[PDB]
């Protein structure tokens, strides 16, 4: 019944300079705050405690102010290991225990623009009842970009999965994927299938396209 | 020395019932409280509960008090967390979690184990390639799969730079789809070989398909 707000959902910032989370309780939990942070596929690991002790094996870098119902943990120099997922937990009252929403810090670069493809069904998936058309978006930045599939010019709606992978580590960039289902039936019944891409890297959207054949 | 060690990756039809462990290592089990928290990868952390194994006195978080029982044994030192009535939400990762007075913060935690919800079948991926016509990029459909896990290496683990292998989703069929894709220097393809070989260990498969185009 004491809640937890993290600060901002995600925060992108440049290596070596300063990050800064907030976390809020709507009941004053006093002090009485632990802070987590959590590497992808792995488990939190304990980063402070008491709003301000730093826990063993933390950092110098890694500080945090409390006291009442808002608190504040800041990474003071980004470093590539920091970049991760932060977690803020009260316990207030003694066993009760809640968590934040968290925080997922990322790498802020440069402005890259995506670099799009389009790929047709397979000859050997039409032989079932589906067809996928495959739009990729590679290694562009930020995260925000917006595909849309039109076939035969009509704009398609919810029948697209899109899947975003993680900041890559040399680039530091994103991939995105949109696959569309159709059914086969619907598939060749349409001729023009096109992909258009807007992100804040192009001048203006990015339009791949191909024909049935 | 400070080591939580639960159980493997689990598959349950809804509304069964699933039990993980969690075997303590390096320091005195009987000493400290054993909280379970749980991960959904829509929200964030999910406090469960928490039990005393010298006592085996149990308190369950509001959300989940009926449906979670948690149990120890001190001769093997494991806390288990039992949940029942499995929805669908309930797909999520699951953490023990050792506490180190009135200074409840959790450490360390446990390798967390996977509890997937879902009465799909086991399934093997049918893998689909992803041909390009006009740097020149190549890919790899797998589709319709289940249970996750699935491994995409290019040529046998020879081609590895550029190579973006796309997180799963879950589809309408209940059924998982993931691509993967790798950008090659264009006049590579007419020359070399570049095979998507992708495993799947639930259900016995192993397939390899030549990504070739036009």
């Known amino acids: 019944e004491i809640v937890m707000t993290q600060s901002p959902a995600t925060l992108s910032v440049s290596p070596g300079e300063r990050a800064t989370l907030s976390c809020r309780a709507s009941?004053?939990?006093?002090?009485?705050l632990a802070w987590y942070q959590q590497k992808p596929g792995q488990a939190p690991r304990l980063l402070i405690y008491?709003?301000?002790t730093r826990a063993t094996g933390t950092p110098a870098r890694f500080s945090g102010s409390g006291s009442g119902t808002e608190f504040t943990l800041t990474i003071s120099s980004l470093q590539s290991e920091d970049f991760a997922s932060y977690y803020c937990?009260?316990?207030?009252?003694?066993?009760?225990?809640?968590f934040g929403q968290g925080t997922r810090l990322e790498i802020k670069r440069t402005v890259a623009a995506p670099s799009v493809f389009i790929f047709p069904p397979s000859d050997e998936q039409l032989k079932s009842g589906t067809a996928s058309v495959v739009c990729l978006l590679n290694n562009f930045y930020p995260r925000e970009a917006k595909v849309q599939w039109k076939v035969d010019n009509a704009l398609q709606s919810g029948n697209s999965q899109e899947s975003v992978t993680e900041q890559d580590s040399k680039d530091s960039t994103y991939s995105l994927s949109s696959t569309l289902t159709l059914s086969k039936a619907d598939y060749e019944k349409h001729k023009v299938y096109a992909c258009e891409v807007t992100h804040q890297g192009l001048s203006s959207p990015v339009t791949k396209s191909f024909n049935r054949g | 020395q400070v080591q939580l060690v639960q159980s493997g990756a689990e598959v349950k039809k809804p509304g069964a019932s699933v039990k993980v462990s969690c075997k303590a290592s390096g320091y005195i089990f009987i000493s400290y409280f054993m909280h379970w928290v749980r991960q959904a990868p829509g929200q964030g952390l999910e406090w469960m509960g928490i039990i005393n194994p010298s006592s085996g006195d149990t308190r369950y978080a509001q959300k989940f008090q009926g449906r979670v029982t948690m149990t120890r044994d001190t001769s093997t030192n494991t806390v288990y967390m039992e949940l029942s009535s499995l929805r669908s939400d309930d797909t999520a990762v699951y953490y023990c979690?050792?506490?180190?007075?009135?200074?409840?913060?959790?450490?360390?935690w446990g390798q967390g184990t996977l509890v997937t919800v879902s009465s799909a079948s086991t399934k093997g991926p049918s893998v689909f390639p992803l041909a390009p016509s006009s740097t020149a990029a190549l890919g790899c459909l797998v589709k319709d799969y289940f249970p996750e896990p699935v491994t995409v290496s290019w040529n046998s683990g020879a081609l590895t730079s550029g190579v973006h292998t796309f997180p799963a989703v879950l589809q309408s069929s209940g059924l998982y789809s993931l691509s993967s894709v790798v950008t090659v220097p264009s006049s590579s393809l007419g020359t070399q070989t570049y095979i998507c070989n992708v495993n799947h260990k639930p259900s016995n498969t192993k397939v390899d398909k030549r990504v070739e185009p036009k």
């Open positions: 979690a050792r506490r180190p007075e009135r200074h409840n913060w959790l450490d360390p």
């Open positions: 008491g709003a301000s």
């Open positions: 937990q009260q316990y207030n009252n003694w066993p009760a225990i809640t």
């Open positions: 009941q004053s939990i006093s002090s009485n």
